[PDB]
Design a protein around this ligand. Sequence first.
Ligand SMILES: *[C@@H]1O[C@H](CO)[C@@H](O[C@@H]2O[C@H](CO)[C@@H](O)[C@H](O)[C@H]2NC(C)=O)[C@H](O)[C@H]1NC(C)=O
Ligand SMILES: *[C@@H]1O[C@H](CO)[C@@H](O)[C@H](O)[C@H]1NC(C)=O
Ligand SMILES: *[C@@H]1O[C@H](CO)[C@@H](O)[C@H](O)[C@H]1NC(C)=O
Length: 145
Amino acid sequence: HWNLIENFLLNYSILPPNSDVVLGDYFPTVQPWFNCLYVTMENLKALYWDHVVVKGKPYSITVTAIICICKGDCRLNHKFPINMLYGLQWFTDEVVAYLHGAIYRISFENKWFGTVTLGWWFNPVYDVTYYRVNNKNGTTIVSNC
Ligand SMILES: *[C@@H]1O[C@H](CO)[C@@H](O[C@@H]2O[C@H](CO)[C@@H](O)[C@H](O)[C@H]2NC(C)=O)[C@H](O)[C@H]1NC(C)=O
Ligand SMILES: *[C@@H]1O[C@H](CO)[C@@H](O)[C@H](O)[C@H]1NC(C)=O
Ligand SMILES: *[C@@H]1O[C@H](CO)[C@@H](O)[C@H](O)[C@H]1NC(C)=O
């Protein structure tokens, strides 16, 4: 089901009219995939899927559909209806969420821990994957580089 990865990447990229660039990020992968007293995985940088808790300090982020960022005061609270791939991506100074066809971005410094617990296929991301995108001929094309 490569088209799921391709659609994600096409939505991520939209670039200027004449772009040919390699994008290196914690993109959804195809090698590991998991489908299961809860599951714990460590050292994740991002997590994608077709109740998820990512611990951090002072802030943490969870998805139960409702997604929230709160201490332990709240910074984010969004509710939404459900070939879209969803997921969370986090960095020292920001949180990026991919939900229901929209990309959201929140800014705040937080110490993240590589600990994620969940209670439905999951796609954990441990490292950076590179993709090349080229839209120079008017159509955006995605390939490996
Ligand atoms: C980039 O590399 C991945 C493998 O890491 C390619 O994935 C293949 O996709 C086809 C369908 O298009 C599947 O039938 C293969 O089984 C997949 N390979 C593996 C190892 O799972 C991907 O197609 C490559 N990108 C492009 C544009 O070709
Ligand atoms: C995501 O891709 C879908 C097509 O699968 C498209 O309809 C939707 O508008 C895209 N979202 C963004 C933010 O580009
Ligand atoms: C752009 O390149 C793709 C891939 O080769 C091709 O399918 C598409 O038709 C091309 N666009 C134009 C306007 O030729």
